């Protein structure tokens, strides 16, 4: 019964090492997720400005 | 008479075992269940990894 206790804790040890590492993946991509949305926004902000500038220029 | 003697001496020893082991087999068989759910939780998270 003590043998089954020491065998069981190793899997719940392996339950942490994946769960900490998989959120260490998603923590990095979210920073990349917010950077591209920042650069795409200034792209879209400059896009709608030029579409209305050239109409006012003509 | 061996069915008289040997069967009832085992029935006395098995119920003396049933007082002491059948509490701890339920402690063992449910600690087995702690492995078999932690096994399928570990497989899906290494997939998620």
């Amino acid at each position: 019964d003590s043998y089954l206790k020491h065998q069981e804790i190793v899997l719940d040890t392996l339950l942490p090492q994946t769960v900490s590492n998989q959120w260490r993946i998603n923590n990095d991509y979210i920073r990349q997720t917010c950077t591209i949305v920042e650069e795409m926004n200034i792209q879209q902000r400059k896009q709608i400005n030029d579409l209305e500038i050239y109409r006012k220029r003509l | 008479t061996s069915m008289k003697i040997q069967f009832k001496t085992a029935m006395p020893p098995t119920e003396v075992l049933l007082e002491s082991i059948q509490s701890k087999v339920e402690s063992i068989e449910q600690l087995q269940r702690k492995l078999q759910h932690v096994q399928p939780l570990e497989q899906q998270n290494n997939e998620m990894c």
Side-chain angles (χ1 to χ4, degrees), chain A residues 2 4 7 10-11 13 15-16 18 20 26 33-35 46 51, chain B residues 1-2 9-10 12-14 16 20 23 26-27 31 34 37 40 43 49:
Chain A
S2 298
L4 190 54
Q7 186 181 3
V10 191
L11 296 178
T13 291
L15 289 175
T18 64
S20 300
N26 286 316
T33 265
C34 292
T35 269
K46 289 182 180 181
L51 289 173
Chain B
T1 283
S2 296
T9 277
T14 281
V16 281
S20 300
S23 67
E26 290 176 352
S27 295
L31 263 287
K34 193 172 180 66
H37 289 282
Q43 289 292 320
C49 178

